[PDB]
Amino acid sequence: KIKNYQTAPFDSRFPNQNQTRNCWQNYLDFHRCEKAMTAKGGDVSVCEWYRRVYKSLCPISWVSTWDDRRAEGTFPGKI
Amino acid sequence: FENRVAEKQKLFQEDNGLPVHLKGGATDNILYRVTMTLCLGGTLYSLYCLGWASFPHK
């Protein structure tokens, strides 16, 4: 639905060689959206786009480390 | 306190051929020997430590 995604497109907010923040941003967004939807009684499928983008750009060890930290309660980012 | 610089000027200008670091007297000698002994001994000791650390103790 409005998808049919190949890869994360060019994001004018992160136009340079260092894409660390682009990955980070999309990871945060997906989890913030997933929280809001799971909370207020809604569907996580709206958070799809962010999941796809961060999946595409973020190294598996980063996502894995961040996931472990959110579970442990030590994720430094605001979700 | 009183100004005794003139006395010190006389002592340090006395023509005895002594280099400034020893011109104060016997104490300069002692302090110098202490300093130089610690420096040289400490350096030997550092070489020994290098020798010790150069080889593995598995």
Binding site: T20, R21, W24, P76, G77, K78 | F1, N3, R4, V5, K8, Q9, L11, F12, Q13, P19, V20, H21, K23, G24, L31, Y32, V34, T35, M36, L38, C39, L40, G41, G42, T43, Y45, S46, C49, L50, A53
Partner: protein, 259 residues
């Protein structure tokens, strides 16, 4: 006989003892950091102190007692001190560069923000402001001391210089207490890293500056300084102002803007 105004120094053992003490201190830090022992470090620190004491003692003998500091020699020492202070400024610059690099682009590990998540900065309006008023005040008292010396007033020079030193000691004690009270440590990421290394090196410079001022205080008590010739005091005061300015930048950057 020479017919130029420059100083031909007697052959001296201090450059060698100084160089060796540098070897003992660096060797010593390595021994301490890796082979758990402080023996070398202790000897190094001791010979270093002995070298500095004897070397500067000799400079006082050469000038106050022997009269080797003609206007030309003094002018040279002025350039030397200015250049030394410049190199110190550049040293701190590297630390300020590290601070701004870290704080202006907070990485995801910090929570992507500054201060990092989990970091509760000191209130810049409490002891850090007190520290600022203390150093600024010592900058005023040292200027009073300088003018008293030039005006030939021994009592007031000693009075003003004493106040300056007391203030430096006060800053040091306050900073020591702040270090102990701080909820963050040097191991608390890049925040603790930049904070302690920058203010730590600054604190070291305050201790050095205070020591330099104490040396001047005692040389003053001994009447070494004339109302017109007192380079040791001038260098100590320039160095003191340098210490004062670095603090202002640390205060504005790390304590205030970085909070």
């Amino acid at each position: 006989h020479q017919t130029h105004a420059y100083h031909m120094v007697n052959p001296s053992p201090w450059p060698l003892t100084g160089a060796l003490s540098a070897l003992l201190m660096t060797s010593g830090l390595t021994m301490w950091f890796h082979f758990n022992s402080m023996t070398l470090l202790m000897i190094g620190l001791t010979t270093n102190m002995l070298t500095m004491y004897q070397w500067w003692r000799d400079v006082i003998r050469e000038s106050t007692f022997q009269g080797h500091h003609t206007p030309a020699v003094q002018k040279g020492l002025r350039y030397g001190m200015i250049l030394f202070i410049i190199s110190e400024v550049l040293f701190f610059t590297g630390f300020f560069w590290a601070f701004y690099h870290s704080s202006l682009a907070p990485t995801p590990e910090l929570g992507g923000c500054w201060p990092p998540t989990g970091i509760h900065p000191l209130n810049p309006l409490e002891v850090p402001l007190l520290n600022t008023s203390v150093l600024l005040a010592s900058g005023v008292s040292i200027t009073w001391a300088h003018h008293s010396l030039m005006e030939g007033d021994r009592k007031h020079m000693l009075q003003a210089l004493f106040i300056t030193i007391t203030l430096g000691v006060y800053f040091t004690l306050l900073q020591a207490s702040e270090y102990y009270e701080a909820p963050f440590t040097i191991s608390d990421g890049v925040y603790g890293s930049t904070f302690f290394v920058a203010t730590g090196f600054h604190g070291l410079h305050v201790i050095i500056g205070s020591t330099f001022l104490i040396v001047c205080f005692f040389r003053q008590l001994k009447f070494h300084f004339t109302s017109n010739h007192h380079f040791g005091f001038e260098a100590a005061a320039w160095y003191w102002h340098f210490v004062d300015v670095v603090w202002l930048f640390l205060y504005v950057s790390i304590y205030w803007w970085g909070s």
